[PDB]
Design an enzyme around this catalytic site. Structure first.
Site, PDB file in Angstrom:
ATOM      1  N   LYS A   1       3.102  11.423  -3.703  1.00  0.00           N
ATOM      2  CA  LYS A   1       1.918  10.836  -4.327  1.00  0.00           C
ATOM      3  C   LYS A   1       0.978  11.928  -4.889  1.00  0.00           C
ATOM      4  O   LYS A   1       0.250  11.671  -5.849  1.00  0.00           O
ATOM      5  CB  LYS A   1       1.189   9.929  -3.324  1.00  0.00           C
ATOM      6  CG  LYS A   1       0.165   8.992  -3.990  1.00  0.00           C
ATOM      7  CD  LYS A   1      -0.316   7.993  -2.999  1.00  0.00           C
ATOM      8  CE  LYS A   1      -1.618   7.379  -3.392  1.00  0.00           C
ATOM      9  NZ  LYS A   1      -1.978   6.288  -2.440  1.00  0.00           N
TER      10      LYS A   1
ATOM     11  N   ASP B   1       0.924  -1.130   0.000  1.00  0.00           N
ATOM     12  CA  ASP B   1       0.000   0.000   0.000  1.00  0.00           C
ATOM     13  C   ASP B   1       0.973   1.189   0.000  1.00  0.00           C
ATOM     14  O   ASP B   1       1.620   1.422   1.008  1.00  0.00           O
ATOM     15  CB  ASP B   1      -0.862  -0.011   1.285  1.00  0.00           C
ATOM     16  CG  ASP B   1      -1.662   1.268   1.530  1.00  0.00           C
ATOM     17  OD1 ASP B   1      -1.582   2.188   0.700  1.00  0.00           O
ATOM     18  OD2 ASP B   1      -2.344   1.355   2.572  1.00  0.00           O
TER      19      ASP B   1
ATOM     20  N   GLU C   1      -7.077   0.899  -4.564  1.00  0.00           N
ATOM     21  CA  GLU C   1      -7.135   0.832  -3.104  1.00  0.00           C
ATOM     22  C   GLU C   1      -8.513   0.303  -2.593  1.00  0.00           C
ATOM     23  O   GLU C   1      -8.500  -0.649  -1.810  1.00  0.00           O
ATOM     24  CB  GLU C   1      -6.780   2.196  -2.473  1.00  0.00           C
ATOM     25  CG  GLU C   1      -5.289   2.509  -2.470  1.00  0.00           C
ATOM     26  CD  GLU C   1      -4.933   3.984  -2.446  1.00  0.00           C
ATOM     27  OE1 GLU C   1      -5.770   4.801  -2.006  1.00  0.00           O
ATOM     28  OE2 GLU C   1      -3.813   4.325  -2.889  1.00  0.00           O
TER      29      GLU C   1
ATOM     30  N   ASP D   1     -12.948   5.688   3.392  1.00  0.00           N
ATOM     31  CA  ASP D   1     -11.514   5.892   3.572  1.00  0.00           C
ATOM     32  C   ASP D   1     -11.156   7.274   4.093  1.00  0.00           C
ATOM     33  O   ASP D   1     -11.096   8.231   3.317  1.00  0.00           O
ATOM     34  CB  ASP D   1     -10.796   5.594   2.241  1.00  0.00           C
ATOM     35  CG  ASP D   1      -9.276   5.561   2.269  1.00  0.00           C
ATOM     36  OD1 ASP D   1      -8.689   5.800   3.356  1.00  0.00           O
ATOM     37  OD2 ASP D   1      -8.666   5.286   1.203  1.00  0.00           O
TER      38      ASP D   1
HETATM   39 MG   LIG Z   1      -4.842   4.728   2.105  1.00  0.00          MG
END
Ligand SMILES: [Mg+2]
Ligand SMILES: Nc1ncnc2c1nc(Br)n2[C@@H]1O[C@H](CO)[C@@H](O)[C@H]1O
Length: 390
Positions: A73, A12, A177, A201
C-alpha cells in the site's frame, strides 16, 4: 421471475491488516478467516512450492524475509523516484526494483526470479478477502466496495481499482477510510443540518486525523493531518529497549545481537502491550531467551505509559493542526470516532477525551473493524435496484 442477488462485501485494504464485512438482516457481520481471525495480515510470501497469503505468510516471515512482501500500500500508484519510496526501501528486507520509473517487488518464486507491480500484490490480498467472504456466505462473491486513505490521489485510486479487477472483483466504488468509519456509526443518517466529525486513526506504523463535514448525508473532507512516523510499532520498540536493558541489569548479558532472541522478545512485548489495554499489569514469560536463561518478568500499565508518554502526547499536535486547517474550534466538533487497534490504549483515549473537555468517544464498533463495517453498509446500498411505486 428474478433470482436472489448475492450479497456485496466491504473490504478495508489496510497497509498492515485487511478486514472484510457483509451487511445482511439489517446488520454488519465482520467475517473471521479460517484461523478465527477477524483481521488478516496484508502479507504475501513466495517459496519454491507455494504462494501463501495472510496469517500463513506472516507466520513464516522470520526465516523467509527476502521473499515475504508486506506494505504494498506504501508503493501503490507511486513513482520509483518519489522521496517516500526511496526512504521506505531502506527498512524493507525484500527487493524493490525500477521498471520505467514504476516500483516492482522482486522475489524467488517456484524456481524463478519474478517481479510484481504493487497492484498485483494487493490483488493477492483481495483474492484472500474474497475467499474468506465466500467461505462464510457459501456462494461466489462478485461485488465489493474498497476503501483508501483520504489523501490518496487519482493514480493511487485507479491502481486500487486495478488490483480489484485483477482479483476478479467488480469494484462498486473506492471510498475514503474516514468516510467509511463515519458511515459505520450512521453519522450520515442524522437528518438535516451540518455535523463536524473528527476521525482519529492510529495504525501500526502511521497516524491520520481527518475532519469531515456531513450535510444531508453529503460528505466533505475539511482537513487531514498526521504523523507518518507514529504508530503501534513505536510503542513495541519502547518495550523492546526497556526489556533489553532489564536483561543487561539482571543477568549481565546483552541480547540485542541474537535476532531470534530480539524477535521472541518483540513478539512477547506486542502481546504484553495488548494485555495492558484491559489489565493494570502483564507478565512476560520466555523460556531460554539467551544462553539458556529463562526470562520471566512483568510490566505495569503505569511503567508502559511512562515509556511511551512522549509518543502518546504527540498525537495531539496533528489534532490541533487539523482544527486550524478546518478553521474550527474543538467545541464545534460534534462526534469523535476512533480507528485502529492502537486506539484501545486507555492513556491514548484519556488524552484525547481530556483535550475535548470530557466528551464521549465513539469506540463501540471495534476500531480495527470500523472501516470495513462502513464499507459493507455502503456496498449493500450501492447494489439496491428498487423501482418506484405509482
Ligand atoms: Mg486503517
Ligand atoms: N488491544 C490492543 N491494545 C493495544 N494495541 C493493540 C491492540 N489491538 C491491536 Br490490533 N493493537 C495494535 O494495533 C496495531 C495494528 O497494526 C498493532 O501495532 C497492534 O499491536
Amino acid at each position: 421471475g428474478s433470482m436472489a442477488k448475492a450479497a456485496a462485501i466491504g473490504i478495508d485494504l489496510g497497509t498492515t491488516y485487511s478486514c472484510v464485512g457483509v451487511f445482511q438482516h439489517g446488520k454488519v457481520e465482520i467475517i473471521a478467516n479460517d484461523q478465527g481471525n477477524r483481521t488478516t495480515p496484508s502479507y504475501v510470501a513466495f517459496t519454491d512450492t507455494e504462494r501463501l497469503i495472510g496469517d500463513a505468510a506472516k507466520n513464516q516471515v522470520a526465516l523467509n524475509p527476502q521473499n515475504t512482501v508486506f506494505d504494498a500500500k506504501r508503493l501503490i500508484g507511486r513513482k520509483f523516484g518519489d522521496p517516500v519510496v526511496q526512504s521506505d526501501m531502506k527498512h524493507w528486507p525484500f527487493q524493490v526494483i525500477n521498471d520505467g520509473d514504476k516500483p516492482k517487488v522482486q522475489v524467488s518464486y517456484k524456481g524463478e526470479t519474478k517481479a510484481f507491480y504493487p497492484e498485483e500484490i494487493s490483488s493477492m490480498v483481495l483474492t484472500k478477502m474474497k475467499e474468506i467472504a465466500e467461505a462464510y456466505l457459501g456462494y461466489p462473491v462478485t461485488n465489493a466496495v474498497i476503501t483508501v486513505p483520504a489523501y490518496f490521489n487519482d493514480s493511487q485510486r485507479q491502481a486500487t481499482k486495478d488490483a480489484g479487477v485483477i482479483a476478479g472483483l467488480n469494484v462498486l466504488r473506492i471510498i475514503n477510510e474516514p468516510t467509511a468509519a463515519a458511515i459505520a456509526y450512521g453519522l450520515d443518517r442524522t437528518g438535516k443540518g451540518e455535523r463536524n466529525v473528527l476521525i482519529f486513526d492510529l495504525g501500526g506504523g502511521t497516524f491520520d486525523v481527518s475532519i469531515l463535514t456531513i450535510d444531508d448525508g453529503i460528505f466533505e473532507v475539511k482537513a487531514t493531518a498526521g504523523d507518518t512516523h507514529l504508530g503501534g510499532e513505536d510503542f513495541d520498540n519502547r518495550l523492546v529497549n526497556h526489556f533489553v536493558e532489564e536483561f543487561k541489569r539482571k543477568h549481565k548479558k546483552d541480547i540485542s545481537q541474537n535476532k531470534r532472541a530480539v524477535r521472541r522478545l518483540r513478539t512477547a512485548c506486542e502481546r504484553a502491550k495488548r494485555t495492558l489495554s484491559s489489565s493494570t499489569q502483564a507478565s512476560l514469560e520466555i523460556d531460554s531467551l539467551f544462553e539458556g536463561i529463562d526470562f520471566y518478568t512483568s510490566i505495569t500499565r503505569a511503567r508502559f505509559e511512562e515509556l511511551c508518554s512522549d509518543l502518546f502526547r504527540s498525537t495531539l499536535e496533528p489534532v490541533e493542526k487539523a482544527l486550524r486547517d478546518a478553521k474550527l474550534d474543538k467545541a464545534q466538533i460534534h462526534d469523535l470516532v476512533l480507528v485502529g487497534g492502537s486506539t484501545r490504549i486507555p492513556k491514548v483515549q484519556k488524552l484525547l477525551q481530556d483535550f475535548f473537555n470530557g466528551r464521549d468517544l465513539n469506540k463501540s464498533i471495534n476500531p480495527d473493524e470500523a472501516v470495513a463495517y462502513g464499507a459493507a453498509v455502503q456496498a449493500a446500498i450501492l447494489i439496491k435496484s428498487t423501482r418506484a411505486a405509482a
